[PDB]
Amino acid sequence: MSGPERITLAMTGASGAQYGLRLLDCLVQEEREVHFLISKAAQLVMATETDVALPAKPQAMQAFLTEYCGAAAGQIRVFGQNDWMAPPASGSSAPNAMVICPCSTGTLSAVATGACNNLIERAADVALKERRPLVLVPREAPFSSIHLENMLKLSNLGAVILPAAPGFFHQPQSVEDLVDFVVARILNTLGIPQDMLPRWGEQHLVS
Template structure:
């Protein structure tokens, strides 16, 4: 992917724990050129509200929370889409996006995408992303995994999705929860072909 080309992304939030990962990814995303179709589920809004103790009711509230909390540069355009709108523009492969990220991704969402059951816009957009051979990145935040979870993720891997569990490293010596969120954001951006150094790269050499 050409890094100079504005990024066209579908970003979904499913109802798993791990709002910090979505929040820090959004913060970084706001600072790069491009546009994103943003689809948070009702469960994701509820989890975000509880984990941040924030008064958020909608996807726009989530975006505004991130803007106010970290004041990132505003170089990115966001299109809000309703979770239940199965007929939205991103439900069709005739529209073009570079990739889709589900962050965090619940095991229910993993199961629905694996089986091709598309009862909401997140599941439908993910299904379209796979069938059009575009990059689909799923970021589960669950532990431990049972056999059903593992088999579903393996099937999605074999279908072309990238499974990127929210498993931040610690070699960068994180000092805050934001550092852990930035680690995962950087890894996701690299999977999308974008280099954002939000944490120090590993090096065995010490200055």
């Protein structure tokens, strides 16, 4: 396979829960192992914006998502917000790429300042120190200078700041096509195959 075998996927409490669930589904379809993390605010966001009845506690959540995505047993690992015994908490862990999708301004802040108040923030801290892939998907508008300064610092350190800003150049017809555009870009960034978003210009030889 091209791309990482294992992805830490963290969902935090920005609007755009559909992006995280769709990414999770695509990662599972590409036979990747997913270490799944979710903040308390992201649970509230998912309750508000989707019809997904996500259980509260990690093992029920794991059973639930494994069924929701059609994953294999053990393919989705779920870890709680203070579970320091999980692989993402230490750089001695097997290497994973990490994506925070969606990324709240509060989680962006914690990662930029090194905060490490829950396992999502610590996992990001580990990714940066180990020079492992870290993709942040912020969903906010306007962006203040505080947001922008935090994104710049992390981009300068090699994190990918991929805002939930879909393009329209493949004539989307539905909300799902817009969600898929952003998910495609994430997968492209990770180097994981996807066929939702064609390769621009691939056919074009001259002019």
